[PDB]
C-alpha cells in the first residue's frame, strides 16, 4: 500500500518483541551468579613463540588434534605450525597477499583462506604429490571475505564485506544457501558445536542466528552500540559472546534472547578484535585492539588475567579444542601459546 | 633428541629459509595504493603504466619494480580494511579537475582526500595527488566560471590560475604538514611523463624514509 503502514507495522512488531523480552526477563545474571566462587587470579606464561611470519598476522585457527594450527598473515603465506615443536609443517604461497581470514578443516584435509580478494581458496594438504594446491576456488562473493568455517569436507560457510553470508558446496563450487538478512558488513562467524546453527556479527551492531540447513534467521540481537568485530559460541551452543569496537563485550543466550551480562571497564577504552571461550565456558578470553588480551570470568565478569606479552594489536585468538592452551596472534608477526 | 622429528627440523629450516627469501624479495619491491574519486581518473593511470574486489598491477621502471593496488571495486567501508595498507610506500590519489562542473563532485573528492590524508593509519605514508583531465579542465574554464563550486574564488578565468587554485585547495586539506608531503601533478593522455613522475616521487619518498630511519630527515 504505502510506506506509512509498513513502517508503523515494523515499529509495533519491534515494540511487541521488546515487551515480550522485558516480560520474560525476570532477573539479571549478576544476582544469580553471585553465589559462584570467583575464579580468582589466573596467571599464564608463554610456553611457545612462533616467529615465522614477516608481516601482520590477521587470522588463525586450531586443528581438531589441538596440536596443529594454521596462521594467515598479509605476507602471502599460510604456515601450519606444530605447536609442540614449533615446526613449520607447510608453507602455502597465497595468490593474494591481502588475506584476513583462514580456517582449518575438522579432518585436517583442507584449509581455507580469504580476504580483500573476494575469491576464496580451498587448499588440499594431503595430496599424493606432497605439494599444497588449491582444490577449489569460490568466486561468487562480491565483498571482501571476513570469516569462514568448515562444516565438512564438502561444506563451508563464508562471510563477506557485503551484507550477506553464503554456504558453499566445495564439490561443485556453488552457493547452497545464501543468507542476506544482515544490514552491515559481516566481520565474524562462529559455528555451533552441533554444526546445525551459526551466529554472524556485522558492523550494524547486531547479531543474527542463521541455520545451515533451513537458512532462515531465528533470533536477532541489537544490544551492542558499535560494529561487532568478533563472535564465539558457548561450548554448549546455547549462548555466544560478541566483541565490539566500543570496548564492550556482551554474552547473548539463545534461550533468553538477551545479553545476560556485559564485560567492560573504564580503563579499557579500545575495541575488541577477537573473543574465545574456554572448554568449561567459565573463562572468556578477549583480544583487544591494544597489545593486551584479557581473561574475563564468563559468569562474574572479572579480569582474571591479562596476557600483555605482545607489542602490537592482537588480531586473532583461539583456544584449543581440548582446552590445554590458547594461541594469540598479533600484528607484530609473532604468535604465542599461553596456558 | 629424536629419530624422525630430526628430519622435520631440517624441513622446517628449509621452509624458514624460503620464507626469508620471499620476505626479502617482497621488501625489494615498492608498494603503492591507488585511490581517488571516480574510475576514469584511476583507469587512465592504471593504463598509462603496466608490464574481483582488489586488482594488483605491476610495472618496472628504471630497475624498480612497482606494485600498484586498486581497491575501487571493494565498495565496502574503508575503516574495516584500510588498515591493510598501513605499510604502503605512497598513496596515489587520482582526481579529475573537471569534477568541479559535474554534479559537486569536487567537494566529495576533497572530503575523501581529507579523510585519507588525515587517517591515523596513513599518518606517515605520503600521497601522490594526480590531477587528471587537465585538457578537459582547460576547456571547461573558458565556458563556466570556477566559482560555481568555489564561492571564495576571485580571479581571472585562465587555465593556469584555476589549476593552481585547485592544487592549493587540495593540498591544504593535510593536517599533518610536518609529517606528510603531497606530490601534485597535472596529467592527461600522456607519454611516460606520468610514470616518470611516479618514479621520481617514489625515489624521494624512499630517500626520506631512509633518512628518517637514520634520524637525519
Amino acid at each position: 500500500s504505502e510506506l506509512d503502514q509498513l513502517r508503523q507495522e515494523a515499529e509495533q512488531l519491534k515494540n511487541q518483541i521488546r515487551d515480550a523480552r522485558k516480560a520474560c526477563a525476570d532477573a539479571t545474571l549478576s544476582q544469580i551468579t553471585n553465589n559462584i566462587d570467583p575464579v580468582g587470579r589466573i596467571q599464564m606464561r608463554t610456553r611457545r613463540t612462533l616467529r615465522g611470519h614477516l608481516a601482520k598476522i590477521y587470522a588463525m585457527h586450531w586443528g581438531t588434534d589441538s596440536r596443529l594450527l594454521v596462521s594467515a598473515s598479509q605476507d602471502g603465506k599460510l604456515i601450519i605450525w606444530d605447536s609442540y615443536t614449533t615446526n613449520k609443517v607447510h608453507a602455502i604461497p597465497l595468490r593474494s597477499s591481502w588475506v584476513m581470514t583462514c580456517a582449518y578443516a575438522p579432518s585436517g584435509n583442507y584449509v581455507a583462506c580469504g580476504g580483500l580478494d573476494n575469491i576464496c581458496s580451498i587448499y588440499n594438504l594431503k595430496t599424493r604429490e606432497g605439494n599444497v594446491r588449491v582444490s577449489r576456488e569460490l568466486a561468487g562473493h562480491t565483498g571482501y571475505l571476513s570469516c569462514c568455517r568448515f562444516l565438512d569436507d564438502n561444506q563451508i560457510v563464508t562471510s563477506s564485506g557485503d551484507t550477506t553470508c553464503a554456504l558453499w558446496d566445495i564439490e561443485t563450487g556453488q552457493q547452497t544457501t545464501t543468507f542476506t538478512g544482515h544490514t552491515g558488513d559481516v566481520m565474524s562467524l562462529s559455528l555451533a558445536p552441533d554444526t546445525r546453527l551459526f551466529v554472524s556479527g556485522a558492523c550494524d551492531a547486531s547479531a543474527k542466528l542463521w541455520d545451515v540447513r533451513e537458512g532462515m534467521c531465528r533470533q536477532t540481537f541489537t544490544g551492542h552500540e558499535s560494529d561487532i568485530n568478533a563472535i564465539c559460541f558457548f561450548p554448549n551452543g546455547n549462548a555466544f559472546a560478541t566483541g565490539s569496537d566500543d570496548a564492550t563485550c556482551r554474552l547473548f543466550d539463545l534461550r533468553a534472547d538477551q545479553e545476560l551480562m556485559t564485560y567492560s571497564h573504564d580503563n579499557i577504552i579500545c575495541g575488541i578484535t577477537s573473543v574465545s571461550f574456554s572448554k568449561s565456558g567459565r573463562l572468556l578470553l578477549a583480544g583487544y585492539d591494544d597489545f593486551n588480551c584479557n581473561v574475563w570470568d564468563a559468569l562474574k565478569a572479572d579480569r582474571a588475567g591479562v596476557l600483555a606479552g605482545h607489542d602490537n594489536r592482537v588480531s586473532c585468538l583461539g583456544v584449543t579444542d581440548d582446552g590445554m592452551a590458547v594461541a594469540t596472534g598479533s600484528w607484530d608477526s609473532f604468535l604465542k601459546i599461553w596456558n | 633428541l629424536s629419530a624422525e622429528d630430526k628430519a622435520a627440523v631440517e624441513r622446517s629450516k628449509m621452509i624458514d629459509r624460503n620464507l626469508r627469501e620471499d620476505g626479502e624479495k617482497a621488501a625489494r619491491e615498492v608498494k603503492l595504493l591507488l585511490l581517488g574519486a571516480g574510475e576514469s581518473g584511476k583507469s587512465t593511470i592504471v593504463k598509462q603504466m603496466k608490464i574481483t574486489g582488489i586488482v594488483e598491477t605491476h610495472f618496472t621502471f628504471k630497475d624498480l619494480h612497482f606494485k600498484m593496488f586498486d581497491v575501487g571495486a571493494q565498495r565496502s567501508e574503508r575503516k574495516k580494511w584500510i588498515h591493510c595498507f598501513e605499510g604502503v610506500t605512497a598513496i596515489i590519489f587520482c582526481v579529475a579537475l573537471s569534477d568541479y562542473d559535474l554534479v559537486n563532485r569536487m567537494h566529495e573528492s576533497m572530503k575523501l582526500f581529507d579523510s585519507i590524508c588525515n587517517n591515523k593509519w596513513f599518518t606517515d605514508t605520503s600521497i601522490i595527488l594526480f590531477l587528471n583531465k587537465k585538457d578537459l579542465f582547460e576547456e571547461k574554464i573558458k565556458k563556466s566560471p570556477l566559482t560555481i563550486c568555489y564561492p571564495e574564488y576571485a580571479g581571472s578565468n585562465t587555465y593556469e590560475e584555476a589549476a593552481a587554485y585547485i592544487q592549493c585547495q587540495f593540498e591544504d586539506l593535510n593536517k599533518r604538514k610536518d609529517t606528510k608531503e603531497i606530490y601534485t601533478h597535472f596529467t592527461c593522455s600522456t607519454d611516460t611523463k606520468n610514470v616518470q613522475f611516479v618514479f621520481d616521487a617514489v625515489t624521494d619518498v624512499i630517500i626520506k624514509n631512509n633518512l628518517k630511519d637514520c634520524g637525519l630527515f
Partner: single-chain antibody, 233 residues
C-alpha cells in the same frame, strides 16, 4: 608418482657403475630419497639416504665410503655412484621416497628397481619369529616381529613400519608407525604392538595378500629390515 631406475646390467668385480632414477609426478625437491636393495635370495637392506636439501647424507656401515648418493633437483633425477663395488653388492636396487613431518607417511612409494649383478652391530635387529606361514582365503594371519630395544620413543610414537612385496612387484607401505595405514591400502589390515612385541593381523584375507611382509624400524637412521614373512596361498 613414478620412479624408473636405470643403470643395471653386468659388471666385473671391482668395477664401478652409477645407478640413476628419474622422478616424475611429485615434488622431488620436497621428498627425501632412500636406496633399498634386495639380494637374489636375502631380504631388503637399506643402502643410503639423502635429505630433501641434499644435506645430512648417511650411509650404512656395510656401504659407508664405498657408495655415493647425489641428487640433482634442477634436473629431477637421483644418482647412486658405486665405486669398487664388491661381489656381495649383487642385488636389485629399489628407489624409495620419503617426507618427514607431523603425520607424514615416509617410504610410501617404491620404484620398480633394476637388477645389478657383479660377475664372479650397534643396530636394531628385527628378529622375525617366522619366515613362512601358510594361509587360506577368508582366514586370518598374525605376523609378529621382535626388536632389540623398545621402539616407543619418548614422544609416544613407535617407529615401526610394515611393508608387503607382492610377487613380481616392488614393496608397498601398508602401515607406518604401527598406527596409520598408507593411502590406497584396504582398511582390513590391522597392525599393533606394545613397543617390543608387535602383531600384524590381516582380517578377511584375499588373494592379493600373497607376498613377503617385511618389517622395518625407523628409531635410528641405520635401518635394518626383517627376514620377511612369505605367505603361501
Amino acid at each position: 608418482v613414478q620412479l624408473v631406475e636405470s643403470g643395471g646390467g653386468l659388471v666385473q668385480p671391482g668395477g664401478s657403475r652409477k645407478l640413476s632414477c628419474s622422478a616424475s609426478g611429485f615434488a622431488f625437491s620436497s621428498f627425501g630419497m632412500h636406496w633399498v636393495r634386495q639380494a637374489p635370495e636375502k631380504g631388503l637392506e637399506w643402502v643410503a639416504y639423502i635429505s630433501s636439501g641434499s644435506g645430512t647424507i648417511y650411509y650404512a656401515d656395510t656401504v659407508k665410503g664405498r657408495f655415493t648418493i647425489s641428487r640433482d633437483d634442477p634436473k629431477n633425477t637421483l644418482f647412486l655412484q658405486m665405486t669398487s663395488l664388491r661381489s656381495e653388492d649383487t642385488a636389485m636396487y629399489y628407489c624409495v621416497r620419503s617426507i618427514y613431518y607431523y603425520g607424514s607417511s615416509p617410504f610410501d612409494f617404491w620404484g620398480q628397481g633394476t637388477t645389478l649383478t657383479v660377475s664372479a652391530s650397534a643396530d636394531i635387529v628385527m628378529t622375525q619369529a617366522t619366515s613362512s606361514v601358510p594361509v587360506t582365503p577368508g582366514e586370518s594371519v598374525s605376523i609378529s616381529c621382535r626388536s632389540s630395544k623398545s621402539l616407543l620413543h619418548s614422544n609416544g610414537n613407535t617407529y615401526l613400519y610394515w611393508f608387503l612385496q607382492r610377487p613380481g612387484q616392488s614393496p608397498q607401505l601398508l602401515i607406518y608407525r604401527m598406527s596409520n595405514l598408507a593411502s590406497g591400502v584396504p582398511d582390513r589390515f590391522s597392525g599393533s604392538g606394545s613397543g617390543t612385541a608387535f602383531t600384524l593381523t590381516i582380517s578377511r584375507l584375499e588373494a592379493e595378500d600373497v607376498g613377503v611382509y617385511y618389517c622395518m624400524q625407523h628409531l635410528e637412521y641405520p635401518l635394518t629390515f626383517g627376514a620377511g614373512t612369505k605367505l603361501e596361498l
